[PDB]
């Protein structure tokens, strides 16, 4: 099947609103994800802390829930622990910590939007590959 709009529609906000990503947006999101965070987050996993992956189950059960574009984009600038009680900006790539993480310095709001779109688009592409790990390679 084509990259239809049904695949390209991803949740935007916590209420339930959706947004249809453009092909340029998903292309840029894939490139930015592979360049800025693929080293640890290849395949929707976390190499440094595999307890917390990027699969939709983990993002949905995060506090705040990270299964939407606004929540993901806020995480890319105000990262926190899985329960949302401690700031981990000094240990996580964030646009507010780009001097110590020189890959986040060039990202704009649209870049963060595209990266979140890539993250939310992936699980629709595969039933278990995104965040599945070795078992589904």
């Amino acid at each position: 099947t084509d990259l239809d709009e049904n695949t390209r529609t991803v949740p935007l906000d916590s209420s339930g609103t959706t947004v249809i990503l453009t092909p340029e947006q998903v292309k840029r999101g894939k490139r930015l994800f592979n360049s800025s965070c693929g080293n640890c987050h290849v395949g929707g996993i976390t190499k440094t802390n595999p307890n917390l992956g990027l699969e939709p189950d983990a993002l949905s059960l995060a506090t705040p829930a990270r299964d939407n574009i606004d929540a993901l984009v806020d995480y890319m600038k105000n990262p926190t622990t899985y329960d949302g009680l401690e700031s981990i900006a000094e240990l996580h790539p964030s646009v507010k910590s780009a001097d110590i993480f020189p890959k986040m310095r060039s990202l704009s709001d649209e870049d963060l939007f595209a990266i979140g779109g890539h993250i939310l688009l992936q699980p629709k592409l595969s039933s278990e590959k995104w965040g599945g790990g070795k078992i589904y390679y």
């Binding site: 080293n39 640890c40 290849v42 190499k47 020189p102």
Partner: protein, 451 residues
């Protein structure tokens, strides 16, 4: 056509350069043109790296191999090994590229229109391969030149800007090496150290004082030896122990250069002082110890007592004892317990990793460095898919250490093969049976039968 065909020389086109052995001027042109090739590649490649360099990523993640050398020499890099300016790299590139034009003109001149043999028009430069004194004078001149190069590195490290010390107090930084170690027991203590684990021979340089002081020693040695060879002739023990032909000299240079290739490959693989991990990326030992460090910090943060945690086999999951008793990171990093890097020494006491520092005083920057070096291990494919062989195609990355080590190990083995070929041929041609066995006087038929 004379001197350039099989009929008048006995060498085919594919052994074409073998027709240059006794043609001194044309051979000089060959050498100078090839040196022009070398400097051309240096300038062109470092300009290519400057053009493809993006200021976001570090050098080791971008596939850059040459700009790390200039950064180590102390150009355009600030504290923490952050490349702040890349204009000196451009200057070095353009200088090499422009000098390549001069060297190429000289080589093409001497190859095509220059005198064929220098032994009648320029007796000072002309030579015979069998004239030991003149060849030794040439060798001594080149030794003096090499000593001048070593002293150029010394001058750069001591006076002109200084070099990048990754072990510097605070973070790694460009600093003047004011007090190199000139003690013979240290410099030649490195040379006589073993190559095995923990010793490392000359790959185990852990400070720039030893490096600069031993480069002073190399400069003094080379200049003294060059003046020795200019004013001396080979002794009788040497005169009977070598084949005095051009191919023999080539084979000697080939074996030496092959050994250097192997040593340089292991320098790039294991050393992280002359090849700082912030320019060339983590070593394999560094990446493994970084994985162990990251998961130690994670599990300690989650309530585990890492010192008392038991792995599956009874050994430490995070911390154990080395075979000599030092407290070391556990798991399969136990083999890499000889790693010493500026980001992990801070937690190291006399008896190994200090448990108090490991428990209470691991800084966030150490965790960041460990995560970065874990995710950027030397593992990768020929098509540059970073990670283990069973990884997926999302990360495009092979460490510069892997490239340099593999390339120079390859070339070292290849040049050992070249040495074997050329040394055997030199011996056979000197003895005079490099073309075949004489049907008239076959040595085997004169030999008494065995058994």
């Amino acid at each position: 056509v004379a001197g350039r065909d099989i009929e008048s020389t006995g060498f085919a086109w594919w052994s074409g350069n073998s027709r240059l052995i006794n043609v001194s001027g044309k051979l000089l042109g060959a050498h100078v043109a090839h040196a022009g090739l070398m400097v051309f590649w240096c300038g062109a490649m470092t300009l290519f790296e400057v053009a493809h360099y993006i200021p976001e990523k570090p050098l080791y993640e971008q596939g850059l191999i040459l700009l790390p050398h200039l950064a180590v020499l102390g150009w355009g890099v600030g504290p923490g090994g952050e490349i702040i300016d890349i204009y000196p790299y451009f200057v070095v590139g353009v200088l090499h590229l422009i000098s390549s034009a001069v060297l190429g003109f000289g080589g093409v001149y001497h190859s095509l229109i220059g005198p064929d043999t220098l032994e009648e028009s320029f007796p000072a430069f002309g030579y015979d391969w069998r004239d030991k004194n003149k060849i030794t004078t040439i060798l001594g001149i080149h030794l003096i030149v090499l000593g001048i190069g070593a002293f150029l590195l010394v001058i750069k490290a001591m006076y002109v800007g200084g070099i990048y010390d990754t072990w510097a107090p605070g973070g790694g930084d460009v600093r003047i090496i004011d007090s190199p170690t000139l003690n013979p027991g240290v410099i030649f203590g490195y040379v006589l150290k073993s190559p095995w684990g923990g010793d490392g021979w000359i790959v185990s340089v852990n400070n720039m004082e030893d490096l600069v002081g031993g480069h002073i020693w190399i400069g003094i040695i080379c200049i003294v030896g060059g003046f020795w060879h200019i004013f001396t002739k080979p002794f009788a023990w040497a005169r009977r122990a070598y084949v005095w032909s051009g191919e023999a000299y080539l084979s000697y240079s080939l074996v030496a250069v092959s050994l250097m290739g192997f040593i340089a490959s292991q320098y790039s693989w294991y050393n992280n002082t002359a090849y700082p991990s912030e320019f060339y990326g983590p070593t394999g030992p560094e990446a493994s110890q970084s994985q162990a460090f990251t998961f130690l910090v994670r599990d300690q943060r989650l309530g585990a007592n890492v010192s008392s945690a038991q792995g599956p086999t009874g050994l430490g999951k995070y911390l154990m004892r080395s075979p000599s008793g030092e407290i070391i990171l556990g798991g399969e990093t136990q083999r890499f317990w000889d790693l010493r890097a500026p980001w992990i020494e801070p937690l190291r006491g006399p008896n190994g990793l200090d448990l108090n520092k490991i428990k209470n005083d691991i800084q966030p920057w150490q965790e960041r460095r460990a995560a970065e070096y874990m995710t950027h291990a030397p593992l990768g494919s020929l098509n540059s898919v970073g990670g283990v062989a069973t990884e997926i195609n999302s990360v495009n990355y092979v460490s510069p250490r892997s490239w340099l080590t593999c390339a120079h190990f390859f070339l070292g083995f290849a040049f050992y093969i070249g040495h074997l070929w050329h040394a055997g041929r030199a011996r056979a041609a000197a003895a005079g049976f490099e073309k075949g066995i004489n049907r008239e006087n076959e040595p085997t038929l004169s030999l008494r039968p065995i058994d």
